[PDB]
Amino acid sequence: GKAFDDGAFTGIREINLSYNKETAIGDFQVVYDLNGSPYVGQNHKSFITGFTPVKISLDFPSEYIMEVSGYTGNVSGYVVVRSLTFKTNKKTYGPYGVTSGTPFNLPIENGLIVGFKGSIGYWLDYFSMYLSL
Amino acid sequence: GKAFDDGAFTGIREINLSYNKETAIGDFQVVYDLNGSPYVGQNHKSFITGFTPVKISLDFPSEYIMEVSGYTGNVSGYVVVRSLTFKTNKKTYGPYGVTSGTPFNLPIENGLIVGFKGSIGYWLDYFSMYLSL
């Protein structure tokens, strides 16, 4: 897919993603915090359309992500992130997508996700997260 | 199991662990670096014997861990860490243990593992890692 790299910010305010229950995660856009102000990140869109949009609006700054988890699987010959789940200190958002394939998870005991990078083609191919105190 | 928490250091020089090809990870001990001196972490021992020891001697500081991965699953009715694999910039150590159950992995694009904490009963029950730049 097309690579992206938002870089690092000071927190996460909102995650906008999309998914389809027959396929996988499609689009991804983060509204970050930047020193106490919102920063609307680039909107990383799939090459195709048809996904169901989701807005995760966090109660920043008291609410923060403690674990990201998901499944990776083959869709129409593409190995991609089929699902995502975001667990905060307040609640769990998801799973969105299809929970089938190889699981992964990043649990955090201390620190914050402050940024995302990855690749999106037809679907979200892969991603990484910037972490900070 | 018995809790352990080595705390954080400057780097990792050597990992000494034990495993059984029918069960899971047993003993775990780390020689860290602390500002250029080796720091011999406490040997965290399984409550039982019958494991195979391994010594993973890293060429510190040029060689460092880039991905820790493994499997968790049932042994004797408990969820434990079944296998570990340490991939450095120079080579791959492992898998040690039994490679079945739920996979997990922590790849690092930027930063260093500087510490371990966790719990060991008959087997290694769980662990976490301290990360630093």
Partner: peptide
Amino acid sequence: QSGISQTVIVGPWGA
């Protein structure tokens, strides 16, 4: 070596 600040980055997951 450079004037760009850095940060811990974990991943990738997916494939």
